[PDB]
Scaffold this motif. Sequence first.
Motif, PDB file in Angstrom:
ATOM      1  N   UNK A   1       1.115  -1.089  -0.090  1.00 49.94           N
ATOM      2  CA  UNK A   1       0.280   0.059   0.497  1.00 49.94           C
ATOM      3  C   UNK A   1       0.805   1.138  -0.076  1.00 49.94           C
ATOM      4  N   UNK A   2       0.630   2.274  -0.381  1.00 49.53           N
ATOM      5  CA  UNK A   2       1.682   3.489  -0.673  1.00 49.53           C
ATOM      6  C   UNK A   2       0.215   4.474  -1.548  1.00 49.53           C
ATOM      7  N   UNK A   3       0.615   5.822  -1.626  1.00 55.87           N
ATOM      8  CA  UNK A   3      -0.335   7.070  -2.203  1.00 55.87           C
ATOM      9  C   UNK A   3      -0.132   6.564  -3.904  1.00 55.87           C
TER      10      UNK A   3
ATOM     11  N   UNK B   1      -7.216   3.214   5.572  1.00 56.30           N
ATOM     12  CA  UNK B   1      -7.191   4.092   4.507  1.00 56.30           C
ATOM     13  C   UNK B   1      -8.274   5.234   4.235  1.00 56.30           C
ATOM     14  N   UNK B   2      -7.848   5.918   3.762  1.00 50.42           N
ATOM     15  CA  UNK B   2      -8.958   7.129   2.900  1.00 50.42           C
ATOM     16  C   UNK B   2      -8.296   6.834   1.184  1.00 50.42           C
ATOM     17  N   UNK B   3      -9.422   6.299   0.525  1.00 53.51           N
ATOM     18  CA  UNK B   3      -9.850   5.800  -0.651  1.00 53.51           C
ATOM     19  C   UNK B   3     -10.835   7.036  -1.021  1.00 53.51           C
ATOM     20  N   UNK B   4     -10.687   6.909  -2.792  1.00 54.54           N
ATOM     21  CA  UNK B   4     -11.936   7.824  -3.359  1.00 54.54           C
ATOM     22  C   UNK B   4     -11.464   7.343  -4.915  1.00 54.54           C
ATOM     23  N   UNK B   5     -12.576   6.920  -5.645  1.00 48.24           N
ATOM     24  CA  UNK B   5     -12.635   7.037  -6.593  1.00 48.24           C
ATOM     25  C   UNK B   5     -13.568   7.643  -7.261  1.00 48.24           C
TER      26      UNK B   5
ATOM     27  N   UNK C   1      -5.549   7.699  -1.803  1.00 47.29           N
ATOM     28  CA  UNK C   1      -4.920   9.153  -0.874  1.00 47.29           C
ATOM     29  C   UNK C   1      -4.245   8.751  -0.351  1.00 47.29           C
ATOM     30  N   UNK C   2      -4.855   8.730   1.080  1.00 45.44           N
ATOM     31  CA  UNK C   2      -3.708   9.009   2.494  1.00 45.44           C
ATOM     32  C   UNK C   2      -4.014   7.749   3.430  1.00 45.44           C
TER      33      UNK C   2
ATOM     34  N   UNK D   1     -16.128   9.435  -1.998  1.00 44.26           N
ATOM     35  CA  UNK D   1     -14.424   9.764  -0.932  1.00 44.26           C
ATOM     36  C   UNK D   1     -14.837   9.405   0.662  1.00 44.26           C
ATOM     37  N   UNK D   2     -14.186   8.753   1.188  1.00 42.76           N
ATOM     38  CA  UNK D   2     -13.769   8.244   2.998  1.00 42.76           C
ATOM     39  C   UNK D   2     -13.088   7.279   2.678  1.00 42.76           C
ATOM     40  N   UNK D   3     -13.767   6.940   4.411  1.00 43.76           N
ATOM     41  CA  UNK D   3     -13.022   6.455   4.951  1.00 43.76           C
ATOM     42  C   UNK D   3     -12.938   5.023   5.032  1.00 43.76           C
TER      43      UNK D   3
END
Lengths: 37, 50, 147, 199, 188, 68, 227, 67
Positions: F14-16, F43-47, F35-36, F54-56
Amino acid sequence: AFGPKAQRKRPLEDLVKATNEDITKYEEKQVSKGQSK
Amino acid sequence: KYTGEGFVEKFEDILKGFPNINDVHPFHRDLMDTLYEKNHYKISLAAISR
Amino acid sequence: XXXXXXXXXXXXXXXXXXXXXXXXXXXXXXXXXXXXXXXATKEFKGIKVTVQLKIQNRQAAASVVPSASSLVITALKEPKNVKHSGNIQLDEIIXXXXXXXXXXXXXXXXXXXXXXXXXXXXXXXXXXXXXXXXXXXXXXXXXXXXX
Amino acid sequence: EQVRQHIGRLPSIDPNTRTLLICGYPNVGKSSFLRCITKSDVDVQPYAFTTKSLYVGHFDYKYLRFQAIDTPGILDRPTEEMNNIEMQSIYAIAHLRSCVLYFMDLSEQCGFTIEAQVKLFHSIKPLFANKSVMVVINKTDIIRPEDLDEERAQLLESVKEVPGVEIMTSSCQLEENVMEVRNKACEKLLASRIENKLK
Amino acid sequence: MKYIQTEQQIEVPEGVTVSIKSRIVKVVGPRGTLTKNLKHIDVTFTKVNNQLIKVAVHNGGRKHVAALRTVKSLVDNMITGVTKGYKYKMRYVYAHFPINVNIVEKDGAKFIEVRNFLGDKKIRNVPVRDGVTIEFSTNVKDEIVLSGNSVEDVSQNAADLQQICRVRNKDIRKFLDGIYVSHKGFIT
Amino acid sequence: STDSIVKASNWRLVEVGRVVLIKKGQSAGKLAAIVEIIDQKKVLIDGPKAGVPRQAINLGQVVLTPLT
Amino acid sequence: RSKRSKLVTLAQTDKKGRENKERIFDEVREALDTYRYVWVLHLDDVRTPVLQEIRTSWAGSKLIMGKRKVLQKALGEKREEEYKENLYQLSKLCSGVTGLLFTDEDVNTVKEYFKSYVRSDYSRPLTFTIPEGIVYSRGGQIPAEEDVPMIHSLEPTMRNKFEIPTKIKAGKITIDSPYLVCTEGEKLDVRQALILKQFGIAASEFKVKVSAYYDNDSSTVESTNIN
Amino acid sequence: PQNDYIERHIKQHGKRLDHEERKRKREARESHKISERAQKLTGWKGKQFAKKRYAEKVSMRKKIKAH
RNA sequence: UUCAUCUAGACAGCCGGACGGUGGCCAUGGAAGUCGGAAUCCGCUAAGGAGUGUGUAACAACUCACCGGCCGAAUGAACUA
RNA sequence: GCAGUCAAGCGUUCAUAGCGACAUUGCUUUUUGAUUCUUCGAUGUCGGCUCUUCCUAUCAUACCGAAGCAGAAUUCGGUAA
Ligand SMILES: Nc1nc2c(ncn2[C@@H]2O[C@H](COP(=O)(O)OP(=O)(O)OP(=O)(O)O)[C@@H](O)[C@H]2O)c(=O)[nH]1
Ligand SMILES: [Mg+2]
């Protein structure tokens, strides 16, 4: 008095008559029924 | 009684073992006089007999 | 030849001591080493400590006392525990007595050397009724008069 | 507890048995004499007070058992009070009924002079009544006692004035004279035991 | 405290080569070859460039990171065993009885045989492990030298040989007999 | 022949910028990008291209893809 | 838990802290306008009466020693911050154990003194073989008839730390083969220097070297190379 | 026998070869064995050990209060 | 959890110094930093106690406590549950 | 056991409103191993022949550990029924 500490260090012609008298004394010296709780 | 005998059987191992400085021989008494100090020797064994 | 060295302390009357091991290895002297020791402690009390160093080469006689030790404060007196706790007048007498010992003491002047000989007096009465520590914290005499 | 750990290590002596005492000044040779006369682990270091307790060694002369009791070596100076190390000697001289070997050094290397040796021998002399003293000079190998001056050899004549004494020369490098010392130590003591047997 | 990753570094010198499949480690160089199995320790090795290899543990506790320093310490001893090699010298001091030490070959197994230890009639055989060669020291009185590639073959075979001569039911302040390890040094 | 054959043990990490697939949840099968990182597990993702907001999210609900 | 248990003691002496550092920060800046000469001296190994010789011989000099980075803190390591000017070049030089000297007698006398001043300390040179008999605490220097046999307490120190093989028959210490500890023209090992330390052989001479000079009124850096 | 004989045997023979290794490796392990006895010793051996271990912490803190 | 120490060099460990008046008074068959009682003060110092331990019959010798040289990131003590 | 003494802790914040572990002092029939010859109301019924089994808190035998443990013997201590 005695041990690793040993602080005491000290306790002629008058010792002659005594020890010659001390030795000669030494050779002169050698020469349930009826009871209950 | 069993603990009471337990202390005495240790004390009977002391008073029997030590060489009874009076009437040994006037030489063996008198090395122990200078080296072991007859007063401290006879008092401590008589304390245990008490 | 050579140039070795030996030392000797204590005593007051002629004797051979502690040096009997060294005199067994070195040149032998019983009457000679006693008189060479008696010449050092001549007119010195046998009760006081006295330190010497003896250098010989084929039966020589040697006697010297460096007097950097408590030999100084023991010198200015008249003689379970033999009390060396005495009262002596140090103020001018130990001031001149500090002049002899300060050959190196590695000190700057007598003002920083007289107080170095004061702690050695951890017995005597000194000057006044008190000649000890804060009784000689400062020294308002001699000082520059010895330099 | 501490007098129990020390009393086990005392040597085993019998006063009624024939012994011999080896007494003299410190740093003389009385330990080195003991090492050559019998099998015993006694240190021979060249300082004054090495032995602080009585050391015993056993030897055999004429089908018998002899034991040789070493002393710590003594300084008498006030004659009434004395060090406990040194006090062990005096009762070994007083009580033990056997011959005593007065072990004198007529030489250089000791803490005392010759003049301090003879004055002590007259001080201990009341202990020497019933004991038939033998005197032995050690270190004769390096001095050869005819070197000695005429007035301080007259002090050796003063040694011979107490009625039964005798002087011998000895060393501790040649092993035949260390034997001949103990033979007169044994034969003189047999004069005392046999005379006490015939009573 | 759940460290995210820790690492150590293994310094590979110029002589040796290291082949690591999953946790099987082979160290080949000048003096010989060695292997050591590490399937129990659960770590991850990574090569960067031919002289340095980083070990790694991701997301581990305190016990799992303390067991990561020791994997550096094992492979470095696998490295110095192949470059320099090991050599333990032992002195076998006796008090009274001359201790006779020999090397005998029974059935091709090459034991070490100790005789006459404290006057005993008992013969003790200490088996020699694979890859440790025992030689008796020339022109130095009373010395036996153990030497081999592995630490744990040599140091165990020297520790075995001194436990076989332990004095029983006596006072060890008095009786001086035994075999001991002088010092643990390298060959070159 | 004088090389170290040490394996690499390739891992998706995992990474940004690691793109991921959401295996379960409301979105359930839509790509998204990390994302972060928040901590070990969240983790904090978004697509936005697929439609996931956009959500944790927790890493147990997501599966990592090789693409970056 | 499972932490390292530190050894706790009962001795008299206590730790200094930062307040001894800031005093040496002040005493260096105070000595600049007071005295006229700045002498920096590299002296790695020292002996204390060697240092107590130089202090008491020179009343006009002040021999101030301390940490290096405190001397950089007080003289000013960068050119932008310094107490007196033209000072940042000479403080660059003090890389070893250095102690500053503040005299006012001469620039010729100070550079002449340390070549004339020479002592003798430990080697840290000539070779030494040990005889294959009883070893002595002098070690074959003086004749062995006058020598003292070594104390047996440091004999386990010899068998383990000094690597010299000593097996002991009786109250003395014996070796059976002759053993040489050093050879000439070789840099001595730390195990070789400690053999010469226990034998008491300080036969290598010691001299203190000086590297630079500064003069306050001239305000320029002077570099002099004597060893 | 024949007064003190071990301390003469220390001087003229030495303690042992590895007597200074083994003794130094005792108290290196004694930091690990005090924590080992306190987790073992089930039933009154964990009582009298804890009474003597607590009597040592009191006796050591009094020496720190001394100076 | 409060107190401290620190990237201007901490903590760990190698390395170097760890001194002069001094073998301080008494004690003694000897006790020199250490079998002991009373003590316990100054000099120079970066720092070095009339001195924590090893032990020589004493001494020597080593050790730490105190500072300094290297290496380059935090670390220690006390407690709470 | 009672009566003190000393004080890490405890007592809404807490030294001194008041508790108090760990230590220690008070004599409990005489400091010189002389003896003390003192059994002081068990108000209540199990004991023993034969025979089996079970705990360990081990008296012996197995193996270790520690002490003035030279050996010889003998003690303390652990694992073990
Ligand atoms: N020249 C010579 N020296 C001797 C002789 N015997 C002994 N010595 C010396 O005595 C030294 C040792 O002293 P010891 O033998 O212990 O004499 P000691 O100290 O009075 O004996 P102890 O009091 O029992 O210890 C040796 O180093 C010898 O040099 C001898 O016969 N001739
Ligand atoms: Mg002698």
